[PDB]
UniProtKB/Swiss-Prot annotation, chains A, B:
It is an enzyme of class 2 (transferase). SUPFAM superfamilies: Periplasmic binding protein-like II (SSF53850). This is ATP phosphoribosyltransferase. Gene3D superfamilies: Periplasmic binding protein-like II (3.40.190.10). PROSITE patterns: ATP_P_PHORIBOSYLTR.
């Protein structure tokens, strides 16, 4: 396949990327949410789409199994973005990386235990606050961890805050704002630039308005 | 909560554990699949259930946020089971850890790249075959990796083989048989044995037939 392969994740990133793609002359021919298929053609015969877990987008792009992709800044920070080029902030799937714990719970006077998927981000954030922390790596449902005493705080993405509030948790600290970024393979950028450039320019134009 | 906290995952493990629980006098009061809730009471007031990602069951059990749980041998091998007690093979959610690649694809003559969630299992298996391999850590959809050239083989769980066959892949090697196991926290076993013992005996009886 000589064309471009675009890596996306289902749900938020796919929903909010599709208008950008449509403006660029690229439309999916079916709904990937309703399929077991993983490779999808588009209305442009030079572009196909891989549907991945969000955590795997940078990996496929890094290794060149996709030429480019859309990934959340939270994922890029955690995975490490040293072997891809971040080209555009698409301003989509907006949220915050935050810390949170049980509402009005005092912090214990000892080395903190942080339950989180974002172990690198958690360590780096707490390092900036002067704390060397223990991390408990989890893969989902971070909001449960404080309720059953697994760790003293969590680090997770927060949008509306409804998940925190539903579970008797409150956000303690804002770490950083998060949005989805367009990343490119470092070799694809050099070899397939003529194919990438119109789509990059289209996206850039669309995000201005 | 002085009673027992049982860690389970949704889908396969929950479906096949429920009959074991029912025989032991423990029934959920609603369907966790249809809820955002994560802590669930049962018909026994001394037992509650946490609903977790499969990868997190050993972690909650290890740290004592759950007293016991049901986890697949594939997860236990990958996570490491040195800080829990494996008490019973429940013979449920049966499958195999296998290697697979594109059907009739020759292996390249160089260090192999293995795309997988099971990075420790992949390294240990290939070590037994005399190969020091590179691993590409993924979080899902392993069946895609060989189709887009991300790695030369995968390591994944296989049940019917339909996923492999649908994607033009075939299993190369059988690594080991996999089934779900009852794991217990090493302190809970010592302190809550009177509560655990009847349920352990019930499960053991049920799996004999
Ligand atoms: N609210 C978000 C959210 N908002 C924006 N995003 C971005 O969307 C990207 C892709 O979302 P995914 O669902 O693929 O990512 P994910 O849910 O973190 O991971 P998966 O377990 O679903 O694979 C993420 O990597 C983020 O950059 C969010 N990602 C996750 N959430 C979750 O939704 C819940 C919080 O929502 P509020 O209750 O509105 O705060 C929490 O569980 C959050 O973790
Ligand atoms: N077929 C199974 C399967 N059979 C049994 N099990 C066991 O069930 C346990 C719990 O299943 P989960 O769905 O929670 O685990 P998971 O799907 O590996 O992980 P999640 O991404 O869903 O969190 C696993 O840890 C295994 O021990 C299986 N776990 C996963 N699969 C998947 O189903 C597909 C293959 O099915 P066949 O096409 O029938 O081979 C592949 O994607 C497999 O990875
Ligand atoms: Mg999600
Ligand atoms: Mg599954």
């Amino acid at each position: 396949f000589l064309g471009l392969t675009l890596a996306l994740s289902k749900g938020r990133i796919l929903e909010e990327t599709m208008p950008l793609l449509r403006a660029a002359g690229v439309e999916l021919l079916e709904d990937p949410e309703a399929s077991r298929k993983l490779i999808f053609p588009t209305s442009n015969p030079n572009v196909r789409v891989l549907i991945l877990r969000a955590s795997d987008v940078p990996t496929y792009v890094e290794h060149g199994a996709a030429d480019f992709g859309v990934a959340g800044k939270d994922v890029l920070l955690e995975h490490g973005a040293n072997h891809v080029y971040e080209l555009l902030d698409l301003k989509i799937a907006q949220c915050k990386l935050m810390t949170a714990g049980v509402k009005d719970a005092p912090l214990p006077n000892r080395r903190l235990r942080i339950a989180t998927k974002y172990v690198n981000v958690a360590r780096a954030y707490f390092a900036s606050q002067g704390q060397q922390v223990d991390v408990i790596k989890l893969y989902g449902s971070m909001e449960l961890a404080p309720l059953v005493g697994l760790g003293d705080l969590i680090v997770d993405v927060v949008d509306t805050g409804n998940t925190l509030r539903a579970n008797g948790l409150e956000a303690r600290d804002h770490i950083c704002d998060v949005s989805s970024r367009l990343i490119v393979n470092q070799v694809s950028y050099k070899r397939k630039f003529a194919l990438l450039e119109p789509i990059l320019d289209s996206f850039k134009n669309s995000i201005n308005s």
